[PDB]
Amino acid sequence: RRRLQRRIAGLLPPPARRLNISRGSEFTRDVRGLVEEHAQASSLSAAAVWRAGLLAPSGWRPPVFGDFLIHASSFNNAEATGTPLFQFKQSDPFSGVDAVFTPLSLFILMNHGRGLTRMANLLYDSPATLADLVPDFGRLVADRRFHNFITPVGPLVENIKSTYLNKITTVVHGPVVSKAIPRSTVKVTVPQEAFVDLDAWLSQPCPADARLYVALTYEEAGPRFTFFQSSRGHCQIMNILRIYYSPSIMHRYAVVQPLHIEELTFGAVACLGTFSATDGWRRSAFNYRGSSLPVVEIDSFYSNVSDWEVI
Amino acid sequence: MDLKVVVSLSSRLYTDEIAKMQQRIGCILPLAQNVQGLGLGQVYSLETVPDYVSMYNYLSDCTLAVLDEVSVDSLILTKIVPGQTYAIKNKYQPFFQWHGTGSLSVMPPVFGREHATVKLESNDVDIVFPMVLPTPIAEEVLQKILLFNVYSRVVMQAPGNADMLDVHMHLGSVSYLGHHYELALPALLDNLSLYFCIMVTLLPRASMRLVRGLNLFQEMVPDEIARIDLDDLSVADDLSRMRVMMTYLQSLASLFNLGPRLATAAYSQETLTATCWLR
Amino acid sequence: MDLKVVVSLSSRLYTDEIAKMQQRIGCILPLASTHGTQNVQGLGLGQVYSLETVPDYVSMYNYLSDCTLAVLDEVSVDSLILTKIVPGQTYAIKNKYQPFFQWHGTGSLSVMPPVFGREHATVKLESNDVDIVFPMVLPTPIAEEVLQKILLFNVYSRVVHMHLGSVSYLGHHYELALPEVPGPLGLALLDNLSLYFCIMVTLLPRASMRLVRGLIRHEHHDLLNLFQEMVPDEIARIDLDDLSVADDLSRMRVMMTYLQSLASLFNLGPRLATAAYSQETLTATCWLR
Amino acid sequence: LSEMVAAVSGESVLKGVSTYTTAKGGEPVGGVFIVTDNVLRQLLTFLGE
Amino acid sequence: LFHSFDLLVGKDAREAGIKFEVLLGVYTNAIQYVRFLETALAVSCVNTEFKDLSRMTDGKIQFRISV
Amino acid sequence: KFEVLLGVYTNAIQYVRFLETALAVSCVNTEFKDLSRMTDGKIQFRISVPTIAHGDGRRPSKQRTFIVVKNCHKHHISTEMELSMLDLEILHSIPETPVEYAEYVGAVKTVASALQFGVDALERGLINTVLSVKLRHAPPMFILQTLA
Predict the structure, then answer these.
(1) One-character DSSP codes across A79-127
(2) CA C81 – CA C9 distance, rounded (Å)
(3) From which residue to which does any coiled coil extend (chain F)?
(4) Nearest residue of E to residue D13 by CA position?
(5) How far apart are the C-alpha atoms of B4 and B77, rounded to whole Å?
(6) φ, ψ for residue C212 (rounded to 5)?
C-alpha cells in the first residue's frame, strides 16, 4: 500500500491555480504562487523538465487498440513488433476469426502462383493453408476488387502467445506504443525491397511530418505491395504516383478493349500513418535463425489508416 | 475539453417522445442554441422540395454531433471535433451491419423520411438523423437509386426500351459482406440524376475540346460511335457549355465524395457500438 | 504546447512597412519550415510566386498543400511573430483580403494562390530583398469556379472570354489575372484531365440519353436550359443500342471510382472548416479540415 | 439443516459485533430455526442433543 | 453529526459508515406572518382583551348620546 | 439552503492474502521486486543417471547425463481503479469550515477504500493466476493413474 500510495501520489495531475478576486490578501499570495509557478516552469533548470511529466489533462492522446482473433498457423511468432497488419474482409457474418496478414505472409500470397522471398518462405513454408484462408485470390485479383477486401489495421504492438487461436493487438488509430506499462517504443518494421522513398524516384518546403502509404497495386503477373514514404498530402501523392505509374498507362492503353473493366484500374493507395520528417526512417536488419533481411525501422509512428483511393 | 452542448427545448417532452428519443440515443445528427434548425429537419420539412444536393451541401457545411443523454427538457450532445473520438452506435431502422469496415459515410437518408426520423407532436420541429452506413453500401445505394431514377424517368417518357421489373430485380438489393438488404424504392433524387445526365451528355464535346487542347494517341481510345461530332459550334455556347459542365462535374465529384466520412476501429456486435473518430 | 514561430528580419523594418504589416494581422501565411525561429527569406508564398516568371497557380496549390500554414498575430521591429495551424486547435482568421468575399453562409474556406493579382497582396519589404505575398482565403464554392476558370482559360485560348476572365459573386464582380501560358504543372493537370476524359468517354452510360431526349421533347426544367432546344447526333447513335442493367451497373461502379478520382484531382489547396463566424467582429473561429 | 444454513448465509450489509452469543460455548449464534412443536420434538430425537 | 448514526451503520469506519454523497439545494419559502396590530386597519378599531365572551349574554349595548 | 446529504456505505470485503490460504502450500513464493525488467528466466537441472553393471554382454550406457531447462512463465495482473477528481482536488486543500471537513474526510474514505480495493483485487488476481498456473500444468487423473 505504501508502494502503491507512493506510486499514485507522484502520478497525479497538479491542481488548477485559483485567484480569489473577492478577498484582498488571498489575491496577492495567489498571484505570488502564479509567478513562482511560471518562473520555475520556464527557466533552464530541472524544475522545467519536472513540469513536463505531469501532462495536465489536447497534446497527448491514448490510442485505440484492435483485439484480433487469429489462427496460429496463419501467423508467425518470430516476427518483429512493428509489422503493419492487413485485415481481410470476411463474407460470413458470424465468423469470429479476422484473417490478418503480415507483409511476408502476404508476399507468399502474392508469389505462390507465379531477399524478400527467402525470408518469406522461411517464415511461412507451407502456403496451401494460407491460400485456403482467403476464399478467392485469383478471381478477386481478376476483377481487381482485392484492394477493398484488404483493410490495414495498423502496426502490431502486443502479441500474446497461444498454440491455437492466437490473439494479437494492433494500434488501429493513434500514437503507436506498446500495451505493457513497462514502457517501450514500437518501432515500425517494413522490409526494404518493398519500401521505396519517393524523393529518390523524384530525384523544397519542409513539412511537419512524412507520411507512410501502402499501395496494393495490380501488376500483370500478380499483385504487388509497395510502401511509399511521402512528405506530401494524400491528394498530392495521388498525382505524384500518377507520375510514377508511367508504364501502367501504356499497358491500359495496349489492352485496347474498354468493356473489360479489369485493366482500367491499377491498384489503390492507402495512408497508413504519420511519422516525423525531421527524424527519417532508419535502416536495420531483422534476423531469423538462419537468414537476415534488411528492414526499414520507423519510430514515433502515429497510425491513422485512410481509405483505398484508386490510381 | 468542455464539449457538452445543450439545446433549448420550448415544450416539455412526453413519455412516448422520451421513449423514441431513447431508442436512437447512440446515433449522430448535425448541428446549426436553437432547436429549430438543430439538424437536417429543415431540408426534410414540408416547407421545401426534398432536393438532394442542397441537403448534401448543408450536411457537409455544418458540424455533426453525437448525443449522450436525453431528458424532459434538455438534450445533452457533444459536437464533433477532428481531434478525438466518440463512441457511436448503429441505431438506424434501415439496419446495415458495420462488420469490420474501417469507414463510415454520412449521407442524407434516401430510404424514406419516415424510416430515420422522430416526429415531435408537442414541439415545433420534427427531427431527422442522417444515414451512417459503410461506404461500399453508400456507393452501391447511390448507384442503385441513381440508375433507378434514370431507368424510371426513361420508362415514364418511353417505356418501349427498358423494363421496370428488370431494373427492380437488381437495382433494389445491395449485397455487401454476405448481408442481403432490400431497398425501399418508391420527387426525390431527380436533380442529382439530371446533373449526372447533363454531365454524361456534354462529356463527349468536353473530351473533344480537351484532346484538341493538346495527338492520335488520345483520339484512338474513343470508339467510332464515341468519336464523331461535327466541328461547327458557336464560341459563347461552347464556353458556357464547358463552364456549366465543369461546374457540375466538380459539384458531382465532391458530392460522390460521401461527405463527412467517419472511421471506426473496434465494432462490438454485442453492444452495437464502435469507437469512431472524424476523418 | 508552444505553437509560435518568430520569423526574424536581417534588416530594420521601416515605419510604413510596420503599418502595412499591422494592417494584415490574422491572415494566413505559409511557412517553409515548422520550427520556432525562422528567417523572412522563405516566409510566405513569394518563393514559388516570383515577379520574374509567369503566374503558375497549380504549383502554388501543391505548395500550399505540402508546407505548413500559420496566422500572423504580432508584428514589431526586426521580427514578426506567427502562430502555426495544427489539427485539434481552433484559430481566429480575419478577412483582410482585397477582393472581399463575405462569409455569410459560414461555408468551408479555401486557401488560394493570389489569382486576383499580386500588387494588392504583394506587401513589400525594402529592408531585405524579399516580397511577402499572402494567400487568398475564400469559400470553396468560389474556389471551384476560380479553379475551373484557371483550367478553362488554357483550353479556350484558341477559341466572351471576359466572362471566364472575371469571377462571379452575389454582390460584385472582381477581375482575376489569367496568364497566356499556364505553366508545366498546369499543363500536366490539363493533360491528366484530357487522358481521364478520353478514357471515360467510352465508359459513359446510354440510358440517360433517353432521359434527356424525352425531357427535351417533353418537359423543360430550369436545368435543361443549356441545350437551346437542340440535340446532337452522337446521342442518337449511342441510342441505337438496347438498354441492359449489368454492363451499366459495372460501368457505374467504375464511374463511381472515376468520379472519386476526379474528386481527388480537383481538391487542391488547404480547406478550413469554419464554426461560429462573427460578422460584426469580422473574425472566424476555424480549424484545419 | 446445514444446507439451509449454507444457502441462507451470504453477503449482507450493516455488520458489527458478535451479537447474541451462547453461554456454554461462547460461540456467536448464526441464525434461528423457527419450527413447530412436533418438529421441535423430532429434531431432539434425531439430532438428539 | 446532528443525528445518532452510530448503531445503525456500525462501529468500524473501514467496513461501514457515513459519506457525504450529494449537496442538495432547497429553497424554503419566506412567508409574511401578519398580526392584527401590525397591520394598519387597527386604526379603525379600538380592540380590547375581553378574554371571556360568555360573560356578555345581552346582545344590545346601551348608547347614552348626550347632546 | 444547501443541505449536505450523508449516505451510508459498506465495504463488503473479506481480506484474503496469498500466504493465509492453503494454496500457498504448493508454492515457494519469493518477492522479486523488479520482475517488470526480467525478459527471460531459466533453471537448469543436470541429472546424472547411474546404471547397473551386468553379466551378459550388453552395450553399456556410459555415464548418461541429462541437462534440461525450464523457462519461466510470465503473466501480468492488471486492475483499473477509478478515482473521481471531484474527490481528488479537495484532498490537496485543508478543511476550515464544517462543510469542508464533512466532504474532505468523505473523500478520504473514498480514496482509501479505492486503495484497499486495489490491493485486494491484485491479491485475488494473484491467487486466481496461481490457481490457473496450477490448472494449466495439471494433467488429468485418468492419464496420471498409469503414466505415473
Answers:
(1) S-SBPEEEEE--SSSS--------HHHHHHHHHTT--HHHHHHHHS---
(2) 11
(3) none
(4) E16
(5) 6
(6) -75, -30
Angle at B128 between CA B123 and CA B134, to 5 degrees: 160
CA atoms within 13 A on the CB side of B189: 22
> Do C152 and B246 contact (CB within 8 A), yes or no?
yes
The chains in contact with chain D, meaning 3 or more Cβ pairs closer than 8 Å, are: E, F
Question: How many Cβ atoms are within 10 Å of C201's Cβ, its own excluded?
Answer: 24
Identify the residue whose cell numbers are 498457423: A73
Give dist(CA B215, CA C194) in Å, integer. Answer: 11
Residue A184: closest C-alpha in chain F: F37
Which residue type is seen at D45?
T
- Cell numbers standing for residue A63: 490510442
Encode chain C in three state secondary structure: CCCCEEEECCCCCCHHHHHHHHCCCCCEEECCCCCCEEECCCCCCCCCCCCCCCCCCHHHHHHHHHCCEEEEEEEECCEEEEEECCCCCCEEEECCCCCCCCCCCCCCEEEECCCCCCCCCCCEECCCCEECCCCEEEEHHHHHHHHHHHHHHCCCCCCCHHHHHECCCCCCCCECCCCCCCCHHHHHHHHHHHHHHHHHCCCCCCHHHHHHHHHHHHCCCCHHHCCCCCCCCHHHHHCCCCCCCHHHHHHHHHHHHHHHHHHHHHCCCCEEEEEEECCCCCEEEEEEC
Residue located via cell numbers 477493398: A148
User: What is d(CA B41, CA B47) in angstroms, rounded to the nearest whole number?
Assistant: 10
Q: At CB < 8 Å, which residues of chain F contact E?
A: 1-11, 13, 102-103, 106, 109-110, 112-113, 116
The residue among A198, A200, A195, A201 whose CA lies nearest residue A210 is: A198
Alpha carbon distance C58, B186 (integer Å): 45
Helix axes C184-200, C140-153, angle to 10 degrees: 90
Residues B95, B30 contacting (CB under 8 angstroms): no
Number of neighbouring beta carbons within 10 Å of residue A127? 16
Cα-based angle A258, A264, A268 (whole degrees, multiple of 5): 170
Contact B99 A93 (CB under 8 A): yes
Backbone angles phi, psi at C247, to 5 degrees: -65, -35
Verify whether the Cβ–Cβ distance B100 to A90 is below 8 Å: yes
Q: Which three cell numbers stand for residue D46?
A: 434425531
Instruction: Write the DSSP string, D1-46.
Output: -HHHHHHH----SS--S--SB-SSS-PBP-------HHHHHHTTTS
Q: Is C101 exposed, middle or buried (0-12, 13-18, 19+ CB in 10 A)?
A: buried
Between β-strands C28-30 and C5-8, what pairing exists: parallel, antiparallel or unpaired? unpaired
CB contacts of F8 in chain D (<8 Å) are: 14
A194 near A215, Cβ under 8 Å? Answer: no
Q: Which of A119, A93, A294, A122 is nearest to A191 (CA)?
A: A294
Closest CA to B132 of B93, B166, B158: B93
Nearest CA in chain F to A6: F115
Integer-rounded Cα radius of gyration of chain C: 23
| Distance, CA of C94 to CA of C115 (rounded, Å) | 19
Burial class (CB in 10 A: 0-12, 13-18, 19+), F37: exposed
Q: Containing H/E element for A230?
A: strand A223-230
User: In whole angstroms, what is the distance from residue A271 CA to residue A288 CA?
Assistant: 29
Instruction: Kindly give the pairing relationship between strand C5-8 and strand C37-39.
Output: parallel
- Taking contacts as CB-CB distances below 8 angstroms, the residues of chain E near F3 are 23-26
Greatest C-alpha distance within chain E: 92
Per DSSP (E only), the strands in chain E are 16-25
Q: A129 and A73 in contact (C-beta within 8 Å)? A: yes
State the method: cryo-EM
* Residue among A94, A71, A68 nearest A165 (CA): A71
F23: helix, strand or coil: helix
What residues are paired with F65 via a beta bridge? F48
**Cα angle C190, C191, C194; round to 5:** 85
